[PDB]
Amino acid sequence: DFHFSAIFQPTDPHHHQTEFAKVEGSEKYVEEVEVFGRQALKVNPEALTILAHRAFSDVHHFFRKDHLEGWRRAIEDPEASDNDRYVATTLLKNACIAAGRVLPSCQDTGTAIVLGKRGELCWTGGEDEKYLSKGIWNAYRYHNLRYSQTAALDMFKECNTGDNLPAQLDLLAVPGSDYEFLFIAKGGGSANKAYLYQETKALLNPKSLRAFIEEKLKTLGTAACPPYHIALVIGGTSAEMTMKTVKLASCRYYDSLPTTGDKYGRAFRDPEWEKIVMEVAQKSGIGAQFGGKYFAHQARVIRLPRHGASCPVGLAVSCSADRQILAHINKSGIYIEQLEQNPAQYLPSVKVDLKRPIDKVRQQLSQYPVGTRVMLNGTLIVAADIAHAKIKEMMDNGEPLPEYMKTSPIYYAGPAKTPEGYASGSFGPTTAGRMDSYVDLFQSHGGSYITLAKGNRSKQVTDACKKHGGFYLGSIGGPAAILAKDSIKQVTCLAFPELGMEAVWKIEVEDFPAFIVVDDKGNDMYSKTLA
Amino acid sequence: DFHFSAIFQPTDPHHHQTEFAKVEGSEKYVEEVEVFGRQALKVNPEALTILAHRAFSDVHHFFRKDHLEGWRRAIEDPEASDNDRYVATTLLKNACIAAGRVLPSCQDTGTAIVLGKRGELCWTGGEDEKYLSKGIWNAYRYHNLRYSQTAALDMFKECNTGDNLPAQLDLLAVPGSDYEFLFIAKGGGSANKAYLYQETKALLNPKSLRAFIEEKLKTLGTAACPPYHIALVIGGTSAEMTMKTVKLASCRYYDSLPTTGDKYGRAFRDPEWEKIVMEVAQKSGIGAQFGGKYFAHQARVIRLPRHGASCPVGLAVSCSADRQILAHINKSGIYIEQLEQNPAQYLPDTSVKVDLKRPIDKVRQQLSQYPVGTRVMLNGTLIVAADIAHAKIKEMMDNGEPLPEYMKTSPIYYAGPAKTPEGYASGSFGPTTAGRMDSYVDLFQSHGGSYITLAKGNRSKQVTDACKKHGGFYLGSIGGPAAILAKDSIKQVTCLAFPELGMEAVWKIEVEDFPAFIVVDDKGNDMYSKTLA
């Protein structure tokens, strides 16, 4: 009467649908042997270093076909908005810059995440995590990436680790003698849009589930640089299993799952509800960041078994920096997923002078409604999460709001490392909403009247800008390479250099595109679509 | 310049502080060999079946010392409320019943969760998941536990799997040649109280974190049968990593982590903020389910590294059915954590009788004479219906059918029983979380039924409004003591409707001396309105 059924039964468990290239001469790192009558694989652990170094280098310069196809779809669809096409064209041109292998596609070169599956008879020496970490260390150290990891010295005292370590190393024990990997360079912004809901059987009917999806998709907003790969997981054996499944779904790792359930509780992809998610995404009007049809590239919906008392639900996205790479080591050597190296084949406003008193810039901006396209020329002051917290702390101790918060628009950003002979590394905006609790405070103290970032913000910012005569300008989210190549002409560290990329910067920019999202009158260009 | 630092650096990674017993003669399942100059261990996979079977049998009848000590503390602490002491005494007596090895400590014998760490040179044949699932299958099939897993035939069509499979099998690749395990029999109610928050740097200061903790602890309520083991995880490399860490922290798996951070971003336990969580829990007044000091046994707070743009936060509890067991397989055989087999040594050495065998309207009149917080003793018939029964009945009404008569004659006990031992009137049969049925009460009451419900946990405001509009009541059973309720209170169980469902059928049961509190009355009063405002 006992029948074993694995929850996950992909028809393509080794990802044969993916194209792989072999690292030249890597067969020298492996040797097939036969021990106690079973075939086994000896792996020089240096192969893990070589593979991780290659994976976390290439993933920042190339994309998968299904990602690039989505941007072209937004450009060619007659039903796409002008803003849909403008954003998708900008992201494809950004991918073209990044394919030059110098500038990463996004300033946020992400957290290094390894899902590894070591066969029972795959022998590495056992030091997999150190050797993988060294390859990750090599990738971020010797390329123009960014150190994004924040170490906690105590509960509140933090410092940057200076090398983008630690990685998330999930190494699983599996049958066989191979070593299979999924590498993810996961941006912080899309990682923040991984949501867990604790639901009940009352959700599990067509009307309630549809209303749920419409409600939750809006809470993603534009804060993770859509078009999104949207993943939705209904059920699961625990919260962490639900959240792991929705992460992997967003990486299209479970695309070959079955599409029907059975009495043993196996996972399945549900294509009908993927279609409903896409229809909700399109009919929402949120669009590719600034209103339109292309809120989403595509959807993945996986139904899981559940404890009778439980219904965990996971919602997660892959952002414009859609960065994952499959790989495996076998008796022939190291194989790594081949990404698209010619993204160019997928390609089918008000000038605002900042070199004036800030009050004159505010007056010019006041003349236009939300949704106006602007082009910034001049100085921006760069300050993100930690700078804002330090500045607020200064003011709480009676110190004045610093002068550099009062002279120029505030660009929420953290740059990647500058290539030799370049004016700037990749330097796109960070999510504006995380700074929302500072706006009214800083504006009441005479600064931060104009902010520049990406993502929809909360109502408190709209009230602050109306009360104080402020503005929030929405940059396009994602195109960090073309912004650095075309717009950013000078970068200087201004304050808090110990913060690394989270220091305060002063940059000179030209032809920096943005939208007026919040004006000084109580208007918000997202108030209709993200009510 | 490269320095590798593992995120988790426990000082006791093999759990030497835990007491283990050897499965007799289990050295016959392993043999040491040497290949390519390295020591390896061949393991008969039958050892995984044996180990899983023993783990998921023993864990339902015994508890760890640190859990039992918490209940005794609630009884002996002068600062504990009378209800704190009453609840803790009831849970200890339940544990004494459960230690008889017939009745499981809770009717929800949980999801079977296996965390396994297979050494690189530990060779099982590779079929670990099948052999582990067979041992779990054995434990739930041949013991008086419960089949709690719900399979989805499509998005909305569901059925019970009938054997408590599938398990959650998380088998990790690690150095060495041994096999180390943490087995968890995770109840549904405490699994539902695992929360993920996406926060920011603006949270990371003493005032914001303190206010955050005070706010979130209240959202746990009493819905997962406190006293809780409270785990809080600040940071993490991803949501799923944060939620895995908070789960393991709640099992005290990370008790030996360091207590300070460093520039490499290692995880650490924070004893100062553990004390703050305990102070917030105690000062909340929520208590051991019915007001008091013992909202929490103990706290675990782990600070993790984070991406500069990210601050995921996890909050999770272990409930009164605190069920985990450590184990390992090595060259000497199979070793399994030793749990406390004499819980009675932790036991140290005024209510209104309600006759339910009357017209339901007369029962409502008697209850109307008492304030919330009154302790009652129920004698008579209860109609048992939980999540699926409620959804099926609502579906019937949506298609024009009347609310069934059996929803109007007796109070509704939200519960799902474990299997009945031979010669027993009932298996373990404690209450389910009341909040999950909140959306049905006003509908059912306006159709003349469900005027009196009996379950555990605080409920939402719509239930208080419904009981006021319709002259209804919500009675809070003690949450957890499923074994002593079955042995002492439940005298007869018969299936009334939906036999095709599993333990989620509608049941008709006769009870005696079934204790409960009036939580919501017919006047707008709620016993939790102050502590869970």
Ligand code: SF4
């Ligand atoms: S800035 Fe946008 S594209 Fe870059 S990692 Fe963050 S969410 Fe992704």
Ligand code: SF4
């Ligand atoms: S009923 Fe209470 S003690 Fe039992 S599993 Fe659910 S939350 Fe835990």
